[PDB]
């Protein structure tokens, strides 16, 4: 029933299957790293990410006269076995918390079904996998075997609090925006969280508040998983499409812009900043992309490799994109089914909706100002549970989000840095 069938321990011996040393397609050289397969198509690498971007392999913090506003550095974080063990257990716990909700179950199912499209072939008469959507697993005999995957959760790079989805690009194809999709690497940590303010006028002001309430890490991970979903189905909105914030004087006086992809991901009233016209533009654009995938599948006559049959892969993508198959067997995109899937991925899976399911306090809008970063430990059940997060039932922390109240539940939070006034 659980999303993760086995409760891995970082020190569990490698078996070359779900506990193995692996290498990722970063187009460069790297020493193998120990990774854990927690679910079909999903892996966790308890290491700081110095791999997806070779130009970001330095965890060392620059001089004090260089650190910006919202950022936190600690080159030693996640360098020991105990930390990696706790990281693995923390990430797994959050996946279970997310999966325990109907919305999270729906999102994770979509993610697992969202296999990156096999569009690496040079000939249109054959389908071939794109190698950067795979990892190389060291087998018991020391040989490497290529395994396709959809998602990898990895530790943050130098800036510990800069969580984000990273994926390998293609020489020509924009995999996260052409309907194809690509393996997503989420830089994330379950060992820290952020403080926000309960009053909207305070939370959206850069000069007020110390961060009384703590964001539930499950929401933060869910936010990244939503981005991952968009990217796996190749419908992420180009980052150059932004909202020139004009609803917050502090954002405005700095000409700050926020991408539509982020507003869409948060959802709620934020998603309304993307007008109907531009929204319809994107819908049509991605509809056309799904059409091309349907046609590319029809042009295929043979498959490259022996991992699976051509008909099998045609079926996995028929299910991913919910395509229709006529009498002749040709695939086509049905407008109704497309709109439903597109809407599910963009309107149903949103941060705002997850807050409703988790019943937690959270920022009311993406257009606010961070307050602080806290060190936390969600592994012990006495601190955080799959079912209630920090707001433990039948305790003084059960009501009024008392568990997220860092002043009441102070034993669960250590403020590492204050951001207010530093913008």
């Amino acid at each position: 029933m659980p999303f993760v069938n086995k409760q891995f321990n970082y020190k569990d011996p490698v078996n070359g299957v779900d506990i193995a040393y692996i290498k990722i397609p970063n187009a460069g050289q790297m020493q193998p790293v120990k990774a854990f397969k927690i679910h079909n198509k999903i892996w966790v690498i308890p290491e700081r990410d110095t791999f997806t971007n070779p130009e970001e392999g330095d965890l060392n913090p620059p001089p004090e006269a260089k650190q910006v506003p919202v950022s936190y550095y600690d080159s030693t974080y996640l360098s020991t076995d105990n930390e990696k063990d706790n990281y693995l257990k923390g990430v797994t716990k959050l996946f279970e918390r997310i999966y325990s909700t109907d919305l999270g179950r729906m999102l994770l199912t979509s993610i697992v079904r969202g296999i990156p499209f096999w569009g690496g072939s040079t000939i249109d008469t054959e389908l071939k996998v794109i190698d950067t959507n795979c990892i190389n697993v060291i087998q018991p005999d020391g040989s490497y075997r290529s395994e396709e995957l959809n998602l990898v959760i990895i530790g943050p790079s130098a800036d510990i609090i800069q969580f984000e989805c990273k994926s390998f690009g293609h020489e020509v194809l924009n995999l996260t925006r052409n309907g194809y999709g690509s393996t997503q690497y989420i830089r994330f940590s379950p060992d820290f969280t952020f403080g926000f303010e309960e009053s909207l006028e305070v939370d959206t002001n850069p000069l007020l508040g110390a961060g009384k309430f703590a964001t539930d890490p499950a929401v933060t991970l869910a936010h990244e998983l939503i981005h991952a979903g968009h990217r796996l189905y190749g419908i992420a909105i180009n980052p150059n499409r932004v909202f020139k914030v004009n609803t917050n004087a502090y954002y405005e006086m700095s000409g700050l812009e926020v991408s539509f992809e982020e507003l869409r991901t948060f959802g709620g009233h934020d998603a309304k900043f993307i007008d109907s016209l531009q929204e319809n533009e994107f819908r049509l654009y991605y509809y056309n992309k799904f059409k091309d995938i349907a046609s590319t599948l029809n042009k295929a006559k043979s498959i490259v490799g022996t991992t699976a049959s051509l008909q099998y892969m045609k079926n996995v993508f028929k299910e991913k994109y919910l395509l229709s198959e006529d009498t002749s067997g040709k695939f086509s995109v049905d407008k109704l089914k497309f709109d439903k899937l597109y809407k599910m991925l963009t309107e149903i899976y949103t941060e705002d909706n997850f807050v409703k399911f988790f019943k937690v306090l959270n920022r009311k809008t993406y257009l606010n100002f961070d307050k602080a970063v806290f060190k936390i430990n969600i592994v012990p059940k006495v601190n955080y549970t799959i079912y209630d997060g920090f707001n433990l039932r039948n305790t003084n922390l059960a009501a009024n989000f008392n568990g997220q109240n860092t002043e009441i539940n102070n034993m669960n939070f250590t403020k590492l840095k204050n951001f207010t006034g530093l913008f």
Partner: peptide, 4 residues
């Protein structure tokens, strides 16, 4: 991304 969390944003600012």
């Amino acid at each position: 991304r969390r944003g600012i």
